[PDB]
Amino acid sequence: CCVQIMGGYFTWTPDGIPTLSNITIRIPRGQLTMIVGQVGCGKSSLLLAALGEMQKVSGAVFWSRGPVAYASQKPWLLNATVEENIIFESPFNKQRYKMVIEACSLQPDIDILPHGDQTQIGERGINLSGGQRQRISVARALYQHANVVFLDDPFSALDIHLSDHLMQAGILELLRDDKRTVVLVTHKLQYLPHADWIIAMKDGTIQREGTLKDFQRSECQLFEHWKTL
């Protein structure tokens, strides 16, 4: 019932080809959904478009906008304290703070920092591995407390240890929140039985949606998802 599109048409530049054409979207509130597809297929573009970013050629986009939490497809950061960019101008909550951190399991990496939590990081601050970068980006939306939370490829950098720990702890905490709708995308399909709603697209066009019954109708797509098993 929440944010959705009827016959969406989207494009980066109005002079070129329309990026998205006839896309129809639906995410239920308080639901964990995933969007998968090919590389370059058009999965982040639809999302940025849903964030008012992409020039829509046509389509209608209904909301509830909200201060939607966000983590870009590549990690970004501010030139300020670990605590600073993690807080992102929010009422500091020791409980929520350490909860988010232990969700991202960043504590060992915070101990190794010269000033730990109050370590100035960034293009001005000190450099660090893109793994920490990704975990911090995720923490940005986690501690964000936002109703509609959003993630883009939070798993690319992390290995399976941190991916499992993060998704379990943090995502299970999000779904543990009352109605904190959280939307993401992934490159691995193992948590697809852990998704509630699913969006499948390829080459800039949606293909399918629906958790269990709507999947089983595909032998092809589901054998593809079964290539890894």
Add this chain to the structure above:
Amino acid sequence: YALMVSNYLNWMVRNLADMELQLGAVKRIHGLLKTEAESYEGLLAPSLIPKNWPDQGKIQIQNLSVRYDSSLKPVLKHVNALIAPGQKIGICGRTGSGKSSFSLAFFRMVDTFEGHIIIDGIDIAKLPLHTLRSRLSIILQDPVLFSGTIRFNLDPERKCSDSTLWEALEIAQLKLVVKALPGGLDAIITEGGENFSQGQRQLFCLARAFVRKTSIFIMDEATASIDMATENILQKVVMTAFADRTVVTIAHRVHTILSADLVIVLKRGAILEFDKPEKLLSRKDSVFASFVRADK
């Protein structure tokens, strides 16, 4: 002349101040002109080195003990490995084990205080670093691009053929995409790659490495950004097209390492029972068994 002074004396002072600023800036640049020794010249003869030198690509490391700077603790130590032509061997593990470090152990990116590596016939301690990295290759974990065109993005020089360019695009599964692009591998990659996706840019980097006919090189979990379908197709195509080549594979996806000849597992600062994949998975005793079972 008193009027003259009353006029120009104040300009004299103000220009003294402004030039003081400017010369402080010049001194800043100059204090930066002081630079550290990079040691490009290696203590080995280029005449002793043949042209197509890294022919076999057999690699034997032993007690290889590295560290980024002298102050930091050793990040990888007491490691030994004889690597045959071994068309495809694998290295994997959890984060921080130093696998990217060991990847950079070849190109002497790291201080390697103890131990040594032998590329067929010779150590690493004597090559010219330019010659060193000129005849090898690597695929960085992160994709980094160049503002320009596919000609310039792949070929800094021009000493290549469009045939081979399209070949590298194809074997990386890019040519199919590029066909849709109006440039003809002549479009413009803008500001490090803000036109294409993460995985797109990673693919470009893979292909760029692939431009080199080198038969020995390495990859740093290049497939992390890549989805599963292209992962399978790409790893297959590269194994086939590089059936002769000797590639060392970092894999953030063990499902990709299940195919290599040898599997190399790093726990903290060394290997734990590097072996063929079948033996390690059927023994179950290695932690790579758990790595492949948590995925399934």
